[PDB]
């Protein structure tokens, strides 16, 4: 009928919050002590259950959890635009910045924006922002607002915890390591990208 531990866990009053949160994409980091402990105790049976939905449960080596739908899933999937991926990669770097340690892990969006413009080909972001823009102040401000919108979209997924009563700061969680799957392996990024596609991690765009 049902495994004993699966039945016992399902009755746990903490379950509904997770069940609704995970199927909306939320990644679970180490911070949420109670939720993470619950998942640790009952990983096997939860994985078995969701596998009936035709969706997969993944625990990457870093220690987080996330839901990955397969081709024939019974719950839809979705992706995110290029700008969000860019912001995610930048966030991934800041986590690793050895000079950052003075900041204890708290950051500010001003640094995020300033750093970003040191890498991306200025126009190649402007075109995604506005074709007519060629470094004007107004379009720079427009991009400044677009990055905030992307960051809110990212937080909803669980990559960053906001802090304090002022939005101009935030904290990064270890779930950002996902954005590095491209460079995880030492082989040519292209074949690795196709391998990721085959595994279902990412779809080409």
């Amino acid at each position: 009928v049902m495994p004993v531990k699966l039945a016992q866990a399902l009755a746990n009053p903490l379950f509904p919050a997770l069940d609704s949160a995970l199927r909306s994409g939320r990644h679970i980091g180490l911070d949420e002590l109670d939720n993470h402990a619950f998942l640790m105790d009952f990983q096997e049976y939860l994985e078995e259950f969701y596998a009936r939905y035709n969706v997969e449960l993944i625990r990457a080596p870093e220690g987080f959890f996330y839901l990955r739908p397969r081709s024939t899933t019974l719950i839809p999937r979705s992706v995110l635009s290029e700008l969000d991926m860019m912001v995610g990669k930048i966030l991934c770097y800041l986590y690793l910045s050895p000079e950052r340690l003075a900041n204890e892990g708290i950051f500010t969006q001003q640094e995020l924006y300033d750093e970003l413009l040191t890498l991306a080909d200025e126009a190649k972001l402007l075109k995604l922002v506005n074709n007519r823009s060629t470094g004007s102040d107004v379009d720079r401000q427009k991009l400044q607002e677009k990055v905030r919108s992307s960051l809110n979209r990212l937080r909803r997924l669980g990559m960053v915890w906001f802090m304090g009563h002022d939005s101009s700061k935030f904290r990064i969680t270890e779930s950002v390591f996902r954005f590095g799957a491209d460079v995880r392996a030492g082989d040519d990024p292209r074949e690795a990208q196709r391998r990721l596609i085959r595994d279902g991690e990412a779809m080409p765009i």
Partner: protein, 323 residues
């Protein structure tokens, strides 16, 4: 939220200002060194001009305009109230120049390398304890107004507050030491990833132990100092003509309480930092022990646009509802 800028208005009125670029600060430091090296404690204008000669040559300025440049710099220095001039009657235009308290403080912060040490704290502490015990005995004995003024009010005003300020300064030096260690840590990890771990581990614990010892001593002293202040306040409570001593006692109590709370808060902050550091090592220094991951990520972002891509995340359809 209402405002109180009166002090700012007054300062803007008096035109207080400091302007010490690198060259002027080097000149002032040369003055301080030369003064420290002489046995007479006095400088003729010639010595100042020679020091400015050396400072100017160090920066490679025009050598034909040393005199007027130096004179105009020195006049403004006097204007900014760092130097005080004395017209030695035997040589006009060759006055004797001496530093003011502000200048001495500025120069000392740089030249006098003050390294924190606990023996200083213990000794200062014992001295203040003895002074305060004497003051308390004098207050309890009692006497006329002259007795009070000479034996209670003056000691507290002119000795105790000085020692407490010195202890505060010592804690500020401890702050600077912590900042140095932080910087050190940062750079040390940035040099090499796998090796530095040990060093880091040692540093952290050493600083924590020093903090603990300091805080313990401070509290153990504060108990008795507060008891003595209470004794003095109780002794004064009976006389209605000694409010000035009451205000001073209140100020001393508040200052000591701030001093004590400070150390506990700092220890908590250091524990947080420690934890942070540890976290960092576990999640990042085992994964890319050879630093390849970060460089590859840099390059991938740099050349990202050559082949965009996007990853996937489950997004269940939201529940539809009516009004």
């Amino acid at each position: 939220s209402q405002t109180v800028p009166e002090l700012v208005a007054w300062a803007r009125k008096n035109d207080f200002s400091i302007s010490l670029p690198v060259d002027r600060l080097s000149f002032l430091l040369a003055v301080a060194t030369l003064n420290g090296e002489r046995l007479d404690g006095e400088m003729s204008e010639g010595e100042l001009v020679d020091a400015f000669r050396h400072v100017s040559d160090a920066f490679e300025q025009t050598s034909e305009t040393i005199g007027v440049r130096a004179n105009n710099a020195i006049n403004d220095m006097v204007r900014q109230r760092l130097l005080n001039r004395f017209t030695s009657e035997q040589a006009e235009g060759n006055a004797i120049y001496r530093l003011t308290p502000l200048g001495i403080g500025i120069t000392d912060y740089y030249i006098r390398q003050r390294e924190f040490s606990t023996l200083r704290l213990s000794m200062q502490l014992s001295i203040v304890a003895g002074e305060l015990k004497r003051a308390a005995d004098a207050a309890e004995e009692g006497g006329d107004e002259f007795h009070w003024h000479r034996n209670v009010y003056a000691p507290l005003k002119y000795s105790v507050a000085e020692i407490f300020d010195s202890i505060d300064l010592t804690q500020r030096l401890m702050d600077e030491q912590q900042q140095q260690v932080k910087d050190d840590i940062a750079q040390l990890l940035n040099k090499d990833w796998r090796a530095a771990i040990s060093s880091c581990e040692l540093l952290l614990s050493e600083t924590s132990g020093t903090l603990r010892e300091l805080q313990d001593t401070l509290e153990a002293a504060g108990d008795k100092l507060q008891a003595n202040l209470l004794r003095i306040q109780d002794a004064t409570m009976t006389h209605d003509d000694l409010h000035f001593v009451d205000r001073l006692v209140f100020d001393l109590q508040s200052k000591l309480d701030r001093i004590i709370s400070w150390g506990q808060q700092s220890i908590d902050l250091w524990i947080g930092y420690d934890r942070h550091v540890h976290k960092f090592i576990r999640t990042a220094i085992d994964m890319d022990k050879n630093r390849v991951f970060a460089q590859r990520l840099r390059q991938s972002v740099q050349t990202y646009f050559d082949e965009p891509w996007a990853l996937t995340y489950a997004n269940a359809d939201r529940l539809l509802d009516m009004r």
